Design a protein around this nucleic acid. Structure first.
Lengths: 615, 47, 96, 35
RNA sequence: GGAUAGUGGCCUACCAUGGUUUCAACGGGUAACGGGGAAUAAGGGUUCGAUUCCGGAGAGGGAGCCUGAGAAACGGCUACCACAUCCAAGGAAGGCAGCAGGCGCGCAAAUUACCCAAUCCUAAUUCAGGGAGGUAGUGACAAUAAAUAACGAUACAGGGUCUUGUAAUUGGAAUGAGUACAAUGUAAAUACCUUAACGAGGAACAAUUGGAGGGCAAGUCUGGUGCCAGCAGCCGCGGUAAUUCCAGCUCCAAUAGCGUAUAUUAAAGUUGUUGCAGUUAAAAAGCUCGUAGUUGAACUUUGGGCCCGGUUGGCCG
């Protein structure tokens, strides 16, 4: 070859072989630089004030505060009364000493409004329910007794994974340890490192003995902005203060909920969920600080959408017939090199599978459903709404006084009540060595809805064919995927997995936790089926297998499927020798009597529908 | 796994630490060298 | 420090995988969006959406131990805890 | 292709004449699972 | 001439047409207060200096002024602008870049503590006052010193009658981390220094952070998971653009410290004055003239003689 021409910038002749095949520049002067930094900061400081417009606690504000002590030898009443002592107001504690659990505390020192909520200690779900509504959780600790091993830490971890807002840790029992301050500091740092293990953001747990540090807590609740939770703030939520039932029909009426609205915003056409009550539809809303009613675009209350109708070794038993049990199977060879269809006809498939929504992509409609509720919301978050809801009559025996137990109201998005087959992420809880199957009834709290479920366990390894292997038992180490039918959640809200048992102090046996992954019907879970047999007799080329079958018709029909062994040797059958399952076969190598003759054959599973849980 | 609330007030016995650990290296490295192959290997497997 | 938006499947190859994939994160001060790098798998369950991670430069690279082109911002902390301590089971990450 | 690179340069220093350790089944592994 | 404490275009009236600049004027940028100084070390240098001392300026932005020796003062006033507070709706009060503190910002920074005992300052003055300052709390910014064991006996392995290692072998000594009478300490306390009493037999009173093709110090290690149209077929072996997929063992370095990220310095002679390079690797204007700039041949009391008083070594002591 020839030595090439060389230049740093390409020659004009060479550009002709290549090419043939405005805003002027600015040099920033100081005043333009000084003005731009002023304009961006002034826009920033308006952003901070307007985002803080929710909490000028004189008329239009309510910070929801829940005192959650962790020790049975710890009363939230004295924790509350120590903090209110630093507001220089004694009459406020007198009015609430008799019997109150919901407090509308107005603070004149810091010009703030607090809503104080104390949950009931006898119910673990009630403690879980009162805390997700709040914007602040105050964890009361002990200086005298250690935290409960199976009760106290379980409260922290249950709140840890379902979503939690900002937090402050306090101590009220520090007087019980020795009075020398060198001893009070030695136990205080022990709790400081203990709370840092659970909640790493705060490296100081507060002592309520010092009135400045008692004010340090009291200021921080009123002043510092609450950290937001994505799933709660994407659907809106209402805390009730007054509930009144009216009569309009012999079987149902209207509840008059007088409460404040926070979150994203509410619409007259959308549904609603009340915890441990169910899902209902809207009737009328009213604004006090216009009137909006549910028009003809109501979402109907039905669990199945009616408009979707138009769109591993197993020992064989001699009495059990190998023909009837093995008709819905396919004889593929590789899990990653096979094909399946989602619309196959099967008696084991549910009849209501045709009545199921076939959602295309999750994240696109998840992004779509947020911006619709942003603009189509009537009740703006940060207002007072008189809420008129539709309500069946026979549930009035369960609703209690809202001033003693919390009564939340949760907004819903589009097509929440309609089902779609979904898959959940699942990680095993700490110190849980009990193995569970893939059909046990499990109660799951995801988002706000609580449902009974028996999902199908699987592995989360990626596959081009979207087919995965089934596990009979839950995998003890890594994350698993549980696929089932449930009402869809468009917020990717976290999920917690448990089962009730009255043996514990709580009626909860925590199994694990996880996240709402997807509403996926393309993902199909398959199971490998192995039936075993003992090779009875051996010849130079013919092997006789015993306890593989028990009828001669089973041998003849199963001739096409290629034969293999667990040692990794393939082969084929030759003829049926006996009636009780003795048959001839041929193999590439010579196998002994400790080897097992096995088959590889595959099927489908169809999961079971969900049911809401109460009690 | 979790730290105890009141904690702050196979198994092989522990190596010495600090000055006494350097005594272990000086004995191990070169006084009475254990394995000799002519090039003074330092970490063999199954010989 | 920046807000994570979504997580990408920037994978080594298709299914037979050396799993090193990471997220798309917007810095909070200048508002610019960058591509991040998370360590080995098992830390992707920690990083959900909108976690406010604290991320630092990646910088040095060899011809092994991470050769992904177009990423220079490893994620050091998620939700204000860590990723070293959170992976080695020292602490726990609060959920939003 | 990390194992292909580590072997490729290793016999090159046979021809250059320098010491290099003889190998085993850790040659192309991540010696440290990361943070 | 006016004005000032006072010189002076400082201002005014008139009259001249000057003054700076390629030796970079003027304009622009500075994420620029200047300096003593800081890091980096073979030299010269490169980078930094908001910050314990000196000097300048500002008290949300401008301007104006009272009092006084001194102020264009803001813990003084007045007006305007921008924020913002109270209410009886007529009006009043503002300025934490002082000390604590809080919001906002961000990767990024502590107690709404004790006292004038010290250092000094102010006053009518030994006496009052001082968030000036000091004491203490938070504080792995940075720096100094060095705990986590030492000795003996028995049995084996050695070098070989005297010297080492090994052991679920054994024995008593010594001590502070701690708790704490008391005393010192301090304005009063905490803490240090001293000390009656208690306080070590290993899962006690248990050290971590990184690293193993080279750099480079440290493996002819192990187990498990997934794939192979690869050999063999009781087992296995090998590959595995699984850039090792997940764990463990062993070894090495530093050590109450250690790693990562960004910036900068050395390595670096990749800024080259010391000290780079331009035929072919980045780079000698197409060629010559020519102002500033830089550089510019040799040459004019050289040599000899006289004495004088010194600082160094010695033959000498």
């Amino acid at each position: 070859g020839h030595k090439s021409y060389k230049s740093k910038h390409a020659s004009k002749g060479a550009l002709k072989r290549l090419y043939k095949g405005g805003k002027p520049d600015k040099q920033v002067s100081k005043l333009q630089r000084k003005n731009k930094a002023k304009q961006l900061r002034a826009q920033r400081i308006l952003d901070s004030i307007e985002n803080r417009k929710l909490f000028e606690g004189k008329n239009g504000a309510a910070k929801i505060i829940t005192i959650v002590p962790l020790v049975n030898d710890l009363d939230p009443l004295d924790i509350l009364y120590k903090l209110l002592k630093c507001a220089d107001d004694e009459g406020i504690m007198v009015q609430e000493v008799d019997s109150k659990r919901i407090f509308n505390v107005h603070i004149k020192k810091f010009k703030s409004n607090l809503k104080i909520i104390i949950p009931d200690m006898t119910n673990f779900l009630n403690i879980l329910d009162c805390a997700k509504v709040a914007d602040f959780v105050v964890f009361g600790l002990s200086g005298v007794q250690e935290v409960d091993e199976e009760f106290g830490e379980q409260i922290i971890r249950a709140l840890e994974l379902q979503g939690i807002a900002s937090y402050i840790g306090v101590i009220s029992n520090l007087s019980a340890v020795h009075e020398k301050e060198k001893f009070q500091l030695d136990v205080k740092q022990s709790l400081e490192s203990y709370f840092k293990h659970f909640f790493p953001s705060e490296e100081r747990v507060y002592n309520l003995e010092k009135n400045s540090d008692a004010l340090n807590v009291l200021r921080t609740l009123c002043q510092r902005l609450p950290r937001s939770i994505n799933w709660r703030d994407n659907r809106g939520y209402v805390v009730a203060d007054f509930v009144d039932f009216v009569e309009t029909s012999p079987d149902s009426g209207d509840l008059v909920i007088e409460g404040t609205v926070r979150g994203i915003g509410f619409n007259a056409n959308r549904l609603v969920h009340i915890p441990d009550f169910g899902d209902f539809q809207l009737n009328k809303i009213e604004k006090i600080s216009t009137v909006f009613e549910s028009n003809m675009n109501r979402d109907t209350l039905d669990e199945y959408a009616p408009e979707g109708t138009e769109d591993d070794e197993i020992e064989l038993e001699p009495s059990e017939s190998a023909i009837e049990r093995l008709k819905r199977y396919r004889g593929l060879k590789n899990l990653y090199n096979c094909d399946w269809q989602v619309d196959e006809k099967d008696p084991s498939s549910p009849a209501e599978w045709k009545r199921l929504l076939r959602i295309g992509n999750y994240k696109n409609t998840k992004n779509r459903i947020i911006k619709e509720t942003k603009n189509e919301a009537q009740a703006i978050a940060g207002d007072r709404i008189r809420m008129f809801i539709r309500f069946p009559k026979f549930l009035l025996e369960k609703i209690q006084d809202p001033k003693q137990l919390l009564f939340a109201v949760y907004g819903l998005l589009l097509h929440e009540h309609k089902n779609a087959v979904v898959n959940f992420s699942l990680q095993r809880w700490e110190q849980y060595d009990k193995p569970v199957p893939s059909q046990e009834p499990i109660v799951v709290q995801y988002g706000v809805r609580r449902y009974t479920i028996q999902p199908l366990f699987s592995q989360g390894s990626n596959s081009p064919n979207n087919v995965h292997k089934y596990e009979r038992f839950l995998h003890p180490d890594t994350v698993s995927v549980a696929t089932c039918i449930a009402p869809v959640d468009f917020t990717q809200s976290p999920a917690i997995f448990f089962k009730p048992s009255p043996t514990d102090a709580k009626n909860i046996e925590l199994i694990g936790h996880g996240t709402f992954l997807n509403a996926d019907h393309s993902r199909i879970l398959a199971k490998r089926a192995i039936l075993t047999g003992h090779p009875f007799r051996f010849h130079k080329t013919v092997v006789t297998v015993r306890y593989m079958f028990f009828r001669p018709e089973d041998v003849e029909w199963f001739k096409s499927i290629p034969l293999f062994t667990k040692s990794g040797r393939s082969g084929f059958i030759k003829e049926s020798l006996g009636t009780h399952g003795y048959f001839k076969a041929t193999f590439d190598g010579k196998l002994s009597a400790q080897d097992v003759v096995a088959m590889s054959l595959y099927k489908r599973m169809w999961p079971m529908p969900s049911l809401p849980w109460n009690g | 796994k979790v730290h105890g609330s009141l904690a702050r007030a196979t198994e092989k016995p522990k190596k010495p630490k600090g000055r006494a650990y350097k005594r272990l290296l000086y004995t191990r490295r070169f006084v009475n060298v254990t394995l000799v192959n002519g090039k003074r290997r330092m970490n063999p497997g199954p010989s | 420090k920046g807000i994570v938006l979504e997580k990408l499947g920037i994978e080594s190859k298709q299914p037979n995988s050396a799993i090193r994939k990471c997220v798309r994160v917007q810095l909070i001060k200048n508002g610019k969006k960058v591509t991040a790098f998370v360590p080995n798998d098992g830390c992707l369950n920690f990083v959900d959406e909108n976690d406010e991670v604290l991320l630092a430069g990646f910088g040095r690279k060899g011809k092994a131990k991470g050769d992904i082109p177009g990423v220079r911002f490893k994620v050091v902390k998620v939700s204000g805890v860590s990723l070293l301590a959170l992976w080695k089971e020292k602490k726990e990450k609060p959920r939003s | 292709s990390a194992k292909s690179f580590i072997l490729r340069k290793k016999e090159l220093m046979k021809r250059r004449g320098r010491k290099v350790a003889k190998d085993s089944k850790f040659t192309g592994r991540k010696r440290r699972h990361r943070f």
